[PDB]
Design brief:
This is part of a larger assembly, with chains A (182 residues), B (136 residues), C (79 residues), D (49 residues) and E (48 residues). Chain B is of the alpha+beta class and 136 residues long. Helix content of chain B is 20%, strand content 28%. Classes of the chains: A alpha+beta (182), B alpha+beta (136), C mainly beta (79), D mainly beta (49), E mainly beta (48). The A-E interface holds A 4-5, 60-62, 64-66, 100, 103-104, 106-108, 111-112, 116-118, 141-142, 176, 178 and E 5-7, 9, 14, 22-28, 33, 35, 37-39, 41-42, 44-45. Bound molecules: magnesium ion (3 copies) and zinc ion (2 copies). One zinc ion (ZN) is lined by residues 16-18, 20, 38, 40-41 of chain E. The structure holds 2 RNA strands. Chain E: Part of the 50S ribosomal subunit. Chain E: Belongs to the bacterial ribosomal protein bL31 family. Type A subfamily.
RNA sequence: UUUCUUGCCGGAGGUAGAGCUACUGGAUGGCCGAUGGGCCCCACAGGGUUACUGACGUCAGCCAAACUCCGAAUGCCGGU
RNA sequence: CCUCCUAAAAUGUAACGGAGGCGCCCAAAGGUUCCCUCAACCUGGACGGCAAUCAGGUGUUGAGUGUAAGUGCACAAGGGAGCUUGACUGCGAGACGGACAUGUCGAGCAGGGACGAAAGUCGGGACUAGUGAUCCGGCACCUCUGAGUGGAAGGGGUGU
């Protein structure tokens, strides 16, 4: 009896739109969205570890799930990094949580980018995956404007069942992403 | 003066002079070559001398290949020393040469000076050698 | 005029002790080895230091199993 | 010494049953461990002496 | 969904300066978020 | 007769030999050309250039007591 | 004392022959149950660059195994998590190796435990170094002895 709006807008007509656009052999061929992954690559926590607390708090407040701390898998002095210290936080969004989250992204956070000129269509993987980084965290209304001690951006990765760039871009355009044209 | 960039082991047992060659027994890059008919360690100074002799007799044209590389080290003890107290220090580089091995290779327009240069090189080697050509 | 070498350990007398076809009692050491160059088969156990020993009387038989060298004990019959 | 020899006694009958080694810098405290004590006939807690 | 280790999630409602309202969920405990510029209110999405 | 010799049968090797796009190294000549040098534009963004140094790959010919995808003859253990 | 080559395809084999390591460490890096698969490269990503964290793909072993080298290990002995102390007591058929003294493996039985639904595994660590005979003496415990007798001193046994 509960159904998120983006899930509905997908199910009712993106199915038929993509089917008539690409003439698939059958229904299961139609590309869909699997998961969206949000992480803060802190890195600079090597000097001081308390940056991770702010990072995880921001991820929790923007995603509704607490993140997990990603430790260093190698030791590198050039960055002054040893085995296993808090370096980043990840959040994996699946299901209706992912659906309403990226609805919120596509409708609220992105318009609040300062001088939003668009997202490059050429940001895709070549296997149907879209990833884009972000320079600031103040766009989400769910962070108080006085909560920012310092700026901390994110990487957002969207994983789809698209075979490659064509259908990946088509699905994301149909979803309402603000792409450019060049 | 050919020396390997590095070796895994600086001190090694002597190469064995048994049998006849099984690889590199035919002329492959040039038109004529020098084939060995004896067993002998061939040092890099001998190779240098033979290469210089061929180059001098051939002058401008022609190209010369050296299919033999001295990567095997030989050691000698300091002089006036009694036996014992460890192994010597490496101060020769040789390549083990069996009969049938083709050592040098020449590609030149004219047969007479080709063979003459090859003979000049042969006279600098410590082995009995002969000149061979691609045709059977 | 001295060498930094010259020191060595004792030989540990490893190797196969009972070859194929020999009759062994239970608990006899069949092969002394470092790794698992041979793996235990039927009625053959593996010691702490990787020696294979018979678990039951019979006749030693070597073999292979999925590319692994194995040692087995064949249950010799009654006289 | 860093890794000295410690001796563990049963908490009940106070018999010195086992001797072992531990890193004193890593473990400045006495070692609590459950070990079999023969005369007691059962597993009793042991403490470093 | 683990027991209580996550920040709480509340059904919310978003209304814009364009007068258009949503129905969604977020961590905003007040249950409603007011925004100035929305999707149909941005020049890029309007084509300007 | 358990010893020994001969025939047969069952065994486990890693030497001699050989092989290397089968590993770790060494190493010859090409083809291609990253990178860098310098030249060439000169902006310092924006592009074509070069005795060259020439990665990676690839075609052919090679080497090794401490190399091995391979691998004898003898010898050794057991049965008969 | 341990590892490799010399060492001549069982074992063993010398030289002031060729190369290295050890006189430790871990209360978890031990026991058990359960799950997982690296390195490298390509592509895309905010600071971020060859290389930090994230995503997709190719990738059967080239990573890693506390520490040398070799033999092993991808079925994992490599990576992760929960519980835990078997890094036990009394023993031990049968073996390897050996001048001797040393040294090494061991199924299985009983007690009392850990883990596991169970089968089962557990008498330290993937394996091989990390050590010192005897005498003399110290400490703890024992239903041993006690120089006429009761004690005691001293002496024995077991662990160290
Ligand atoms: Mg995809
Ligand atoms: Mg001559
Ligand atoms: Mg030393
Ligand atoms: Zn007790
Ligand atoms: Zn609006």
């Amino acid at each position: 009896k509960a159904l998120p709006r983006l899930k509905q807008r997908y199910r009712e007509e993106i199915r038929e739109a993509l089917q008539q656009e690409f003439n698939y052999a059958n229904v299961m061929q139609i590309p869909g969205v699997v998961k969206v992954v949000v992480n803060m690559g802190v890195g600079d926590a090597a000097r001081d570890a308390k940056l991770i607390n702010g990072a995880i708090n921001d991820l929790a407040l923007i995603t509704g799930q607490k993140p997990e701390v990603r430790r260093a898998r190698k030791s590198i002095a050039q960055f002054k990094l040893r085995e296993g210290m808090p370096i980043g936080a990840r959040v994996t969004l699946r299901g209706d949580r992912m659906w309403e989250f990226l609805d919120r992204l596509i409708s609220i956070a992105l318009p609040r980018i300062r001088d939003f000129r668009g997202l490059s269509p050429k940001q895709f993987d070549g296997t149907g995956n879209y990833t884009f980084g972000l320079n600031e965290q103040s766009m989400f209304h769910e962070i108080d404007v006085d909560s920012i001690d310092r700026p901390r951006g994110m990487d957002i990765t969207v994983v789809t069942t698209a075979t490659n760039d064509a259908e990946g871009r088509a699905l994301l355009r149909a979803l309402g992403f603000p792409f450019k044209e060049n | 003066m050919l020396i390997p960039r590095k070796v895994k082991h600086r001190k090694q047992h002597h190469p064995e002079q048994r049998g006849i060659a099984s690889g590199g027994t035919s002329v492959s890059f040039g038109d004529y070559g020098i084939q060995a008919l004896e067993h002998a360690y061939i040092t890099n100074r001998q190779i240098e001398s033979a290469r210089i002799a061929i180059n001098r007799h051939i002058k401008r044209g022609g190209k010369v290949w050296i299919n033999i590389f001295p990567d095997r080290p030989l050691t000698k003890k300091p002089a006036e020393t009694r036996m014992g107290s460890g192994k010597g220090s490496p101060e020769w580089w040789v390549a083990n040469v069996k009969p049938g091995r083709v050592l040098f290779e020449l590609s030149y327009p004219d047969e007479k000076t080709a063979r003459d240069a090859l003979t000049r090189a042969i006279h600098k080697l410590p082995i009995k050698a002969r000149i061979v050509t691609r045709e059977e | 005029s001295s060498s930094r070498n010259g020191r060595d350990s004792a030989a540990q007398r490893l190797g196969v002790k009972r070859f194929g076809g020999q009759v062994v009692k239970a608990g006899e050491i069949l092969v002394r080895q470092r790794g698992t160059h041979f793996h235990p088969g039927v009625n053959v156990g593996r010691g702490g230091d990787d020696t294979l020993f018979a678990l039951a009387p019979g006749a030693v038989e070597f073999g292979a199993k999925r590319g692994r060298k194995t040692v087995n004990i064949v249950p010799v019959a009654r006289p | 010494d860093v890794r000295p020899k410690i001796t563990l006694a049963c908490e009940v009958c106070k018999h010195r049953n086992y001797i072992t080694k531990k890193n004193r810098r890593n473990d400045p405290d006495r070692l609590e461990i459950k070990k079999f004590c023969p005369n007691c006939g059962t597993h009793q807690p042991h403490k470093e002496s | 969904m683990k027991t209580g280790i996550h920040p709480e999630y509340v059904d919310t409602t978003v209304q814009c300066g364009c007068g258009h309202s949503f129905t969604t969920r977020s961590t905003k405990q007040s249950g409603t978020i007011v925004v100035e510029v929305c999707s149909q209110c941005h020049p890029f999405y309007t084509g300007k």
